[PDB]
Design an enzyme around this catalytic site. Structure first.
Site, PDB file in Angstrom:
ATOM      1  N   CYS A 133      55.482 -23.491 -28.110  1.00 20.14           N
ATOM      2  CA  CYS A 133      54.988 -24.856 -27.985  1.00 20.14           C
ATOM      3  C   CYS A 133      53.614 -25.007 -28.524  1.00 20.14           C
ATOM      4  CB  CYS A 133      55.055 -25.299 -26.525  1.00 20.14           C
ATOM      5  SG  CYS A 133      54.640 -27.015 -26.183  1.00 20.14           S
TER       6      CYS A 133
ATOM      7  N   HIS B 165      57.286 -22.551 -22.110  1.00 22.76           N
ATOM      8  CA  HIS B 165      56.323 -22.418 -21.088  1.00 22.76           C
ATOM      9  C   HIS B 165      56.491 -23.426 -19.990  1.00 22.76           C
ATOM     10  CE1 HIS B 165      53.642 -25.878 -21.934  1.00 22.76           C
ATOM     11  NE2 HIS B 165      54.063 -25.713 -23.169  1.00 22.76           N
TER      12      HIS B 165
ATOM     13  N   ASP C  74      51.210 -26.577 -27.126  1.00 23.20           N
ATOM     14  CA  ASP C  74      50.376 -26.640 -25.928  1.00 23.20           C
ATOM     15  C   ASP C  74      49.146 -25.648 -25.991  1.00 23.20           C
ATOM     16  OD1 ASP C  74      49.752 -25.803 -23.018  1.00 23.20           O
ATOM     17  OD2 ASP C  74      50.903 -27.608 -22.766  1.00 23.20           O
TER      18      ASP C  74
ATOM     19  N   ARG D  34      47.383 -24.211 -23.706  1.00 20.92           N
ATOM     20  CA  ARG D  34      47.424 -23.120 -22.717  1.00 20.92           C
ATOM     21  C   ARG D  34      48.488 -22.088 -22.954  1.00 20.92           C
ATOM     22  NH1 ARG D  34      49.355 -27.010 -18.338  1.00 20.92           N
ATOM     23  NH2 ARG D  34      50.625 -27.426 -20.185  1.00 20.92           N
TER      24      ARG D  34
ATOM     25  N   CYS E 290      55.550 -27.934 -19.573  1.00 20.88           N
ATOM     26  CA  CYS E 290      55.716 -28.427 -20.967  1.00 20.88           C
ATOM     27  C   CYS E 290      55.934 -29.948 -21.024  1.00 20.88           C
ATOM     28  CB  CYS E 290      56.875 -27.719 -21.606  1.00 20.88           C
ATOM     29  SG  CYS E 290      56.922 -28.104 -23.343  1.00 20.88           S
TER      30      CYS E 290
HETATM   31 ZN   LIG Z   1      54.778 -27.687 -24.133  1.00 22.74          ZN
END
Ligand SMILES: [Zn+2]
Ligand SMILES: [Zn+2]
Ligand SMILES: [Zn+2]
Ligand SMILES: [Zn+2]
Lengths: 202, 204, 208, 205
Positions: free
Chosen positions: A50, A105, A52, A54, A108
């Site tokens: 992803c 993850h 993302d 983190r 999400c």
């Molecule tokens: Zn995500």
């Protein structure tokens, strides 16, 4: 906050962070790692995860030249998405990576949006369609985690990983090298609240 | 089997050992503060668009988890027809409200070098790279006031490609509105794979 | 040359002469009413998605200008990450508020034939046609039941392809809403190139 | 009901019926000859790229099935990174060997009107229409010379968009080689929705 950089941070502040990255590598390894980097790349792993902030291949604490990376919203590997397909093509066909990790993850945004059916707008509704399909296709199973949101989202996140791994394995260059046993494929889940990475059952 | 942390021959356990390090390392320096913040949401300040290349990741900024929203693809190509790019751009700006966006190419880019050759690459890639091929054609032999040296041609092409992606990024609906409100800033950059040094590209 | 109205050797003026006839024909039958309506805006009742093929156009429905909103591409493929198709669908439903959508394949479709082969085409087309190659791969046994007649095999793939495009169309956020509100209606069809006839394609019942 | 052949409330049978008329009409004038040729393959002489608009449409050229290979999309945008259009063009030139390509814009084009605003459309259409918003920006001083009649503003933009599309079409590799071989003709046009008439657009050279 406790982060290295901020909204207010300057261009020089960014370049300072980058001078630190070089100094650190050099401190532990000399010029040897950039000398290698500077001749070619021979990474061993393709990471698909992803977008993302983190999640992210950082969690594997590798050096530059180890992992080929593709990242997108909700770590979706679709056959019609030419972005994914080139990266996979190139990774297997040119770099000869020996491992592919598909990593999803917890928390999400794509996964949570796909659960609550309010049109996101722009292109995101189209982008997330395969996830919305996965949820629909697994309704009974998801329903059995109904009595706790975070777990339903997590189960979905896992289903999405599995979905992407199957699609990955059906990729032409993948499918070949996979059955010639030249390659290995893993689904994973990244726990956002702990920083731990676990393997998805496939 | 390397001066790298892992090789082709590593194990799931070996991999998981690296990740155990990552976690112990963060905890050593910051305690639980990050994985507590992470666990309740992300508020990255920056969007990073760069190449998939294993040397030119966002790592070169030495940031912690929770700081930078990332997209990576072959040769850091940003195109309005590409729902993947545009989805990321859209989400970053409207939802995450990132304040900085960075488009980073880099030296020794395979997509860029291929874009300089005759040999058809094959499959989906040759089509993927067409946007770069167009940039080479659209820029004279400005490319090769340099055919004395391959490497400089590649670098200028790479920078032109960065400029290409930046302009495209700026013409995105969310981006054009954000930039007009002066609520976001945009940077193009080059990563030198040989030095680990990031540098700025001047955008026209 | 020769059964057809225009040819390769035709002229710009020849084309304009055809267009003159098109205008005169409509005025002859409807007076000025249609062009007056057209001039005030469009209110089409139908969206047609079909193949680019010169034989298989929406003209097979004998409608007047202002009736049918049209998208045509190779092998009438509707895919959720094709921004062309999805713009057309969003607009038709959201803005024009069509009441009918028709996804229409046809026999002797070259996109289908190409997909039944394994030989690479070249350019963009091998990737454009990739959704069709998948449909063929996911129905391989069903299709090889028609090894007796290649024509019927290709016709079956054309139908599966229609069914695939329709299903994708219905998963569009605007469509899925309009549908569940029963405000729209969606038809799979097939056009027989040799007869000029239009058949309905049976579409699977709702399963998720 | 309408003065149009079919309504919002029309039926499937009703559609089949208009198609039955289509078939009858064609054999009435030409016998089984068109459908026999059709049934064996296609040899169109022209490729038409135009807008999806229900009022525009290659039927304005009054041709029989088997003459014109058609692509239609919103505001008849020919963009080099759009694979839908690029496939049609490739196939048309390389395989069907069409001798004419026609890019046709039209008056009252909704994609044009939406590109004249910079109000966001939403969904996909802001992205789709971006190359037209570009055209507007690069010709701003010109289009503002048409302020007092908004409809002639949209007509000029619709003509600019046609010129831009035709320019992109000709940079297609198939097109380029064909163009240099004097093997093909390319025309810009505009369709006046209010009148049914089709005019040529002057393209630079
Ligand atoms: Zn995500
Ligand atoms: Zn690269
Ligand atoms: Zn066809
Ligand atoms: Zn239009």
């Amino acid at each position: 906050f406790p982060f290295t950089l901020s909204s207010e941070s300057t261009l020089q502040d960014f370049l300072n962070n980058n001078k630190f990255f070089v100094d650190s590598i050099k401190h532990n390894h000399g010029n040897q790692i950039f000398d290698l980097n500077g001749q070619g790349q021979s990474p061993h792993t393709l990471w698909i995860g992803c977008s993302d902030s983190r999640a992210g291949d950082q969690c594997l604490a590798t050096l530059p030249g180890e992992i080929f990376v593709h990242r997108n919203i909700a770590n979706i590997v679709n056959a019609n998405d030419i972005s994914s397909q080139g990266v996979i093509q190139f990774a297997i066909d040119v770099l000869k990576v020996k491992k592919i990790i598909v990593c999803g993850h917890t928390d999400c945004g794509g996964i949570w949006a796909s659960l609550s059916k309010k049109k996101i707008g722009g292109v995101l509704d189209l982008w997330l369609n395969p996830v919305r399909h996965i949820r629909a296709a697994n309704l009974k199973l998801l329903e059995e985690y109904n009595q706790d949101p975070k777990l339903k989202a997590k189960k979905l996140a896992e289903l999405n990983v599995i979905s992407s791994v199957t699609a990955l394995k059906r990729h032409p260059s993948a499918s070949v090298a996979l059955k010639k046993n030249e390659i290995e494929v893993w689904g994973m889940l990244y726990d956002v609240a702990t920083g731990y990475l676990s393997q998805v059952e496939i």
